[PDB]
Design a protein around this ligand. Structure first.
Ligand SMILES: NP(=O)(OC1CCCC1)OC1CCCC1
Ligand SMILES: [Ca+2]
Ligand SMILES: [Ca+2]
Length: 309
């Protein structure tokens, strides 16, 4: 398997558990710091980064009823410049660029308590697919499915329904949606970190998935595995393989990696393309920093880049 070693340029550092890199509709860059703690309690932050200087600005430190959050993944909305943030303690949040936020749901469509979320991905129809590796949201005691299989997958529909679409995952993490050339949602790809597997489902409609299948295999026997992922314009799936110093590159059909990208750090966590460029920003947990490197082609357009009209 071919391995490339592109030039990585440091953007910023000192961001505990650097995760969820994302660009909003104005081109501003944000990342989350899930591991920031105060007096031993979660006090996660959402930050805006100045790409020119690397200076950081905390725009939101989510907390609900005295319970701090652990923000871990982001997606920018299309019809409004707001961020949807997956939080391991608070569930799903909607954050405005001014720092104000709102809790989306405490319970799902079946009346069951919401589970803590890790990452999310919009399909072009506007539905948000979310991974939930944690147990019940605060005030419930914090727990995670790294050992036991209780991680779930949700779909937050355009008509505002929070539906659990599947469960029994051992730490579902990264997630992505493969679209057809005509823009129709085709497959849902979900990373199960410790098992070194990538799973896929056929998307039949909003919150409707079938044919669960082992889609790809993540290399290595190291502790960790697939974390964050995203597609490039040719539908190649780039996956951060936390713990193995590489970002794996899978072809549209999955299976085994077709190429690997060697990183100058052991723990790549998540990534995101800068709109209309080949530039990929990567967060990593060895130095808790953000880097950028040039890929071979542009990234697949995110939902926020599409036009409603
Ligand atoms: N980056 P993440 O999705 O998973 C990595 C840490 C566990 C192994 C891979 O976890 C984030 C949420 C909890 C804090 C960091
Ligand atoms: Ca993650
Ligand atoms: Ca991303």
């Amino acid at each position: 398997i071919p391995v490339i070693e592109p030039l990585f340029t440091k953007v910023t550092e000192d961001i505990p558990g650097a995760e969820g890199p994302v660009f909003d509709k104005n081109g501003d860059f944000y990342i989350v710091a899930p591991e920031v703690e105060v007096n031993g309690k979660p006090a996660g932050e959402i930050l805006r980064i100045d790409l020119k200087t690397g200076k950081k600005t905390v725009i939101c430190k989510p907390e609900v009823n005295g319970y701090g959050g652990i923000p871990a993944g982001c997606q920018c909305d299309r019809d409004a410049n707001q961020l949807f943030v997956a939080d391991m303690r608070l569930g799903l949040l909607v954050v405005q660029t001014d720092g104000t936020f709102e809790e989306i749901a405490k319970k799902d469509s079946e009346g069951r308590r919401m589970q803590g979320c890790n990452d999310c991905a919009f399909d072009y129809e506007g539905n948000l697919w979310i991974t939930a590796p944690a147990g019940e949201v605060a005030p419930a005691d914090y727990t995670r499915s790294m050992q036991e299989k209780f991680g779930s997958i949700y779909c937050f529909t355009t008509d505002g329904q929070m539906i659990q679409v599947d469960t029994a995952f051992q730490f579902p993490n990264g997630i992505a949606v493969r679209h057809m050339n005509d823009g129709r949602p085709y497959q849902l790809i979900v990373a199960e970190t410790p098992t070194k597997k990538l799973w896929s489902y056929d998307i039949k409609g909003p919150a409707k998935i079938e044919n669960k299948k082992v889609w790809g295999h993540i290399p290595g026997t190291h502790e960790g595995g697939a974390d964050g992922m995203d597609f490039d314009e040719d539908n190649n799936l780039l996956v951060a393989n936390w713990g193995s110093s590489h970002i794996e590159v899978f072809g549209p059909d999955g299976g085994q990696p077709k190429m690997r990208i060697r990183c100058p750090f052991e723990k790549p966590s998540n990534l995101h393309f800068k709109p209309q460029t080949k530039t990929i920003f990567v967060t990593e947990h060895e130095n808790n920093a953000v880097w950028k490197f040039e890929w071979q082609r542009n990234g697949k357009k995110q939902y926020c880049e599409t036009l409603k009209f």
